[model samples]
Target: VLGKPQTDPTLEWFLSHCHIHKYPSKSTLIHQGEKAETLYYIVKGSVAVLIKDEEGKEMILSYLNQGDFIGELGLFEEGQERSAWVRAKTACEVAEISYKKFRQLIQVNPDILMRLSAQMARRLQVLIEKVGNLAFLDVTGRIAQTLLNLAKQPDAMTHPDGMQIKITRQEIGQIVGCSRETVGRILKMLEDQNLISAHGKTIVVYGTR
Candidate 1:
């Protein structure tokens, strides 16, 4: 949903029809095997979508940063059941759209349909690239690449100056499909090497070239 144009009409429509809700950290928004009934657009903060492994441990599939839309695939499939759970990593503002309303909105707004198509396509492309990276790259390479992407996201949010990257070790692990311990260890190493620093919930890139 990033880079999707927000025209006045679309903005007005969302303001009128979309219900905004807040979720505190660690709150679960979706559960595995639940019927897919709605989709969410993140307004603030981030969420991690995960699935259960054979050992009953949650394995992170991806993180949804701010401005990211989620649950669309489930909604698109009509009878699709949620295959994962979404947990908020921080307090988050999300716009919720019921499946019926989502279909109606797209039919009424052609621009949204066009943007949605493009967004889905882009997500597919990124996932493909991620698969390739996972197949060939070492854990360190994977972490570095994911961090680079996270660091750059805030720039897209508003502007570069004073933009904060809000994330935690657990959240990073969720996004990169790794364990919390692994993420913490790598983050500590990066901090020790002066590659990055953290202040509370925010990460700051240091010594940018």
Candidate 2:
């Protein structure tokens, strides 16, 4: 990787041994409940973090893009359990680093630890805002907002068939914090209202009407 003159040498040094990997869209980079061994740093593109319910139905916790780190939370835990899944939201490239090596980097270089702290802090702020979102927004509003967010993704516009998205009802609920039935019902309401078009596992979100 060529380092930009403006980029931090600390990050370059920290990731010196980390190999960059590439994944296609919708690929699972890591699985929840799996034994954690490494952390991933996004070099390009987007990824979704998800957690599953008791019945193995997954819900999305967050989305991350360029310059973001995934699996930092697993570093602090003893059992090395992955708390969530990391799936490629778009075709992506990432730097992979090991747990033991990261711990070593922290001991040898406080700057790396500081970098980690700073990034996690930003995520914490977003999570705090989401807590407020949860408290203030009704379910339909939340789903609508989520759909709007999806509609705005660069990948969403790449479809040859309008703004069609290849996703399941369960996955939408996973993203919106509701049951599939609720997602199904509200999705129909949205479509009936001429706000979206859905069939099978695909959907096309239209402009707000």
Candidate 3:
């Protein structure tokens, strides 16, 4: 069913999944690590979710357009919180499904369980992989690897459109498990080698995956 084309669900099809929620633009639905009780499936318009605060400095985790799905991470793990800050972008119509209802759907549809299970596992695996990288890789190696991680990602931001991997060096340090200045110095050298480039909070890495 997944390999086959997924057309827009008709009204009756969607009502079976969940009740509808239409939200205004620039409004937040939930915060990072918030207890996720609601399952949100993008039915119309688009979604812009983040991991950081909007009042201060921030990061845009993703901007999803079309019939995308979110909240599987919470459902996959017992008592798990949301991984990102989900907010409204444009006037959006979303499906608000409860966990109980979702369970019923999964029972009837193995494809739902199969597809979501893999997605759930990958989240933990990536974190495990990054923590593993921390133990063995040097600062430079870790930095390169993070770029590879972002580049390897399949959704949201994609390659060939731009972005050879760059973010706030301090932010990268959190992932790289090092100080901000050290990240700057290490990246400064990489800039000289022409393997990457940086300025302000935005930069790009060219070579190596």
Give all candidate RMSDs, comma-separated: 5.4, 4.8, 6.9
Cα-based lDDT at residue 58, candidate 3: 42
Off by over 4 Å in 1: 1-7, 54-57, 78-81, 124-138, 155-164, 194-202, 206-209
| Candidate number with greatest lDDT | 2
Distance (Å) between predicted and true CA of 58, model 1?
2.6
lDDT of 3 by residue, 1-209 (tens): 11222453343343457765676676665576564665666666665555544453343344444465567557766533445766765577666777787777777655666554654455345542343344556466676565544444422144353354335466565556464677666777655555655442554444324
TM-score of each: 0.69, 0.70, 0.56
| Candidate 2 ranges with C-alpha deviation above 4 Å | 1-6, 79-81, 127-138, 148-170, 188-209
Residue range 1-209, candidate 2, lDDT tens digits: 46522267777777675666787888887888464777677767778778776686565665667677778877776523356788898788767788877788889878887877677676645542221244445357666655554555443553444465556465666776787788767887756545666553666666322
Query: What is candidate 1's lDDT per residue for 1-209, written digit by digit as tens?
Result: 32333445665465355566678888776777464777667766777667676676665555666666667777667532356677877787667777778778878887655655565566545542232344445356565555555554443132243225566575556555566577677788665645665442565554221
lDDT, model 1, position 200: 24
- Ranking the candidates on TM-score from highest down gives 2, 1, 3
Clashes of each: 0, 0, 0
lDDT of 3 at 182: 73
Ranking according to lDDT, highest score first: 2, 1, 3
Q: Cα deviation of 207 in candidate 1 (Å)?
A: 9.0
